[PDB]
């Protein structure tokens, strides 16, 4: 609830932006607005994204890393 309102990533680096994730059936779409537009978010990409999450950053997310 707190983080769904933060559309920008700053703290830390990576001053780039955040797309909207929309679910259509079994496919996840990284709906970039204009910053192509509806790039299909392949499960390989989301696996790579999840792989780099630190243990503290997933503990605060509520999921125990071990």
């Amino acid at each position: 609830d707190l983080c769904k309102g933060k559309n920008i990533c700053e703290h830390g680096g990576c001053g780039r932006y955040q797309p909207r994730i929309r679910r259509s059936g079994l496919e996840l779409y990284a709906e970039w607005k204009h910053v192509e537009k509806k790039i299909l978010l392949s499960p390989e990409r989301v696996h790579e994204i999840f792989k780099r999450i630190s243990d503290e950053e997933c503990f605060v997310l509520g999921m125990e890393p071990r």
């Binding site: 559309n7 920008i8 607005k33 204009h34 910053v35």
Partner: protein
């Protein structure tokens, strides 16, 4: 001709030769005071200083910008403001009270920090010009911390000729400028035409656009630039939106901070942030030579404000488009805003039909946005100019057909939660029914001999004294009819009886129609008692 010194100053001290426009050259030779007051309209140029002189600039940002620019131009110019250094203020007051351009803000112009200094500079006659900077309707607008001068400065400064400088000079506006400033007739009119072919004036309707955010993002992509959102943190919202869409935009809500803006502005000056969003602010910062768009997301207040904020684009002459995003909801919201503003304004001040000048100014903006034709022609008509003969560069100039279709679609686009909905609809649809000049109070006092206790009472709105007298006479006729049915004492006590009955009804009533209804209800009771043949007791 001293024109020799003018040429020398332009060549070396100024860095020009005043050749941008011969009109400003003629204005400069007019300010030599061979005429009775000169009214020059600062447009794409200036020539003051030469044409100690006090500079009445309401906002200190212009004071700074100009004094530092002149100092870099090898000119000894001083400035006076409260934010200035205390030691600098003390030494400047010391060196000006005794033995060549002064920039001041009107807050201390009528205060003890400068009024004795003003008298000293007037009695010694050390002043040669009392010029008000960017004397836009700035004079006739705002907290009005300045008469305009009337005789409190135009005359208080017998010498110092006094010269005016406004961006927009419409007939009524310029004549009110002369009336308020007491500019001695015949004021020399030096007015430049407002037509500019480098601006692609057009109006887009937010309702017709499926995604106004995307359309305005595409607009700023095909182009620095200053979009203008009205207020209500919508400036910050729009800045974030554009930043989301890929337009690095910042904000300028007055509710930020000199600090916040201090950088926020300079960042923009050096293209660090290409786009900056302001609410109604940014009266300064006008030197960019790029300003590729000043498209207004929200409607302005009048042709004065709209034209002033939109002419900032295309300083070097390159095309700069500039648009206006219009919404009917925004139109009626701002109409409510000004109507309530003037309603509270009359509660604290006099009639001041300029209050209604504002409302037909806004109506002129609305009808200009909702009209069919050249936008340049409309602004020239409002400013008193002639046909611009503008080529492509308008909504109507470039494509008359598309604008007509868009307007036709907009016409057909009209058609506990409902409580606010109905309240807004009713208030907006009957507020417009009141029309212009909504003051109309003219409370008449009791003339000479009104038999009315606490007659001068404003508790019941729109209850004229004559109406209460009419009700009193009706009660008197009812009591006389009872008199010739029951044989009471006389009429002398019946007069007081009717007065007391009217006062009781007045106290028991809260609105005019209810008061009249209660008056008529008593009259029947009486007549009924007369039919009952019994005297009308209490």
């Amino acid at each position: 001709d001293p024109e020799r010194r003018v040429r020398s100053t332009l060549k070396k001290v100024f860095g020009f030769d005043s050749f941008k426009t011969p009109l400003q050259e003629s204005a400069t030779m007019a300010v030599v005071k061979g005429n009775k007051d000169v009214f020059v309209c600062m447009p794409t140029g200036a020539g003051k200083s030469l044409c100690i002189t006090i500079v009445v600039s309401p906002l200190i940002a212009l004071i700074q910008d100009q004094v530092d620019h002149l100092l870099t131009l090898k000119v000894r110019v001083s400035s006076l403001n409260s934010k200035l250094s205390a030691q600098e203020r003390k030494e400047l007051l010391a060196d000006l009270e005794r033995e060549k351009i002064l920039y001041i803000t009107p807050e201390m112009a009528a205060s003890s920090s400068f009024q004795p200094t003003l008298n000293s500079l007037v009695s010694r006659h050390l002043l040669s010009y009392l010029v008000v900077d960017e004397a836009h309707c700035v004079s006739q607008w705002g907290h009005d911390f300045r008469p305009d001068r009337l005789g409190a400065l135009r005359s208080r400064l017998g010498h110092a000729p006094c010269v005016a400088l406004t961006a927009t000079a419409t007939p009524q506006v310029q004549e009110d400028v002369f009336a308020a400033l007491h500019l001695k007739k015949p004021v020399a009119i030096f007015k430049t035409p407002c037509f500019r072919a480098n601006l692609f004036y057009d109006v887009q309707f937010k309702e017709l656009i499926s995604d106004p955010y995307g359309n305005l993002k595409d607009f700023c992509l095909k182009a620095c630039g200053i979009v203008y959102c009205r207020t209500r943190e919508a400036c910050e919202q729009l800045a974030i939106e554009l930043s989301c869409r890929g337009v690095n935009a910042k904000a300028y809500h007055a509710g930020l901070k000199a600090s916040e803006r201090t950088l926020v502005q300079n960042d923009w000056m050096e293209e660090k942030v290409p786009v900056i969003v302001a609410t109604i602010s940014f009266g300064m910062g006008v030197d960019k030579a790029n300003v590729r768009f000043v498209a207004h997301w929200n409607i302005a207040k009048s042709m004065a404000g709209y034209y002033q904020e939109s002419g900032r684009a295309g300083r070097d002459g390159k095309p700069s488009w500039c648009r206006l995003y219009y919404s009917r909801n925004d139109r009626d919201q701002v109409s409510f805003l000004i109507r309530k503003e003037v309603a509270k304004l009359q509660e604290k001040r006099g009639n001041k039909a300029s209050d209604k000048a504002t409302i037909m100014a806004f109506d002129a903006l609305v009808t200009f946005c909702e009209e069919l034709g050249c936008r340049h022609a409309a602004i020239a008509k409002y400013f008193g100019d002639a046909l611009p003969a503008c080529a492509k560069g308008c909504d109507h100039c470039q494509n008359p057909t598309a604008v007509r279709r868009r307007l036709e679609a907009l016409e057909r686009s009209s058609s506990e939660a409902h409580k606010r909905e109905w309240n807004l609809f009713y208030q907006k649809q009957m507020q417009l029914r009141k029309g212009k000049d909504p003051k109309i109070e003219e409370f008449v006092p009791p003339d000479e001999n009104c038999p009315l206790k606490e007659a001068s009472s404003r508790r019941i709105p729109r209850l004229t004294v004559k109406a209460r007298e009419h009700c009193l006479r009706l009660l008197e006729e009812a009591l006389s009819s009872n008199r010739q049915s029951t044989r009471t004492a006389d009429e002398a006590d019946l007069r007081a009886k009717a007065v007391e009955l009217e006062h009781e009804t007045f106290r028991n009533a809260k609105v005019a129609n209810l008061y009249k209804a209660s008056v008529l209800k008593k009259v029947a009771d009486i007549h009924r008692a007369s039919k009952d043949g019994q005297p009308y007791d209490m």
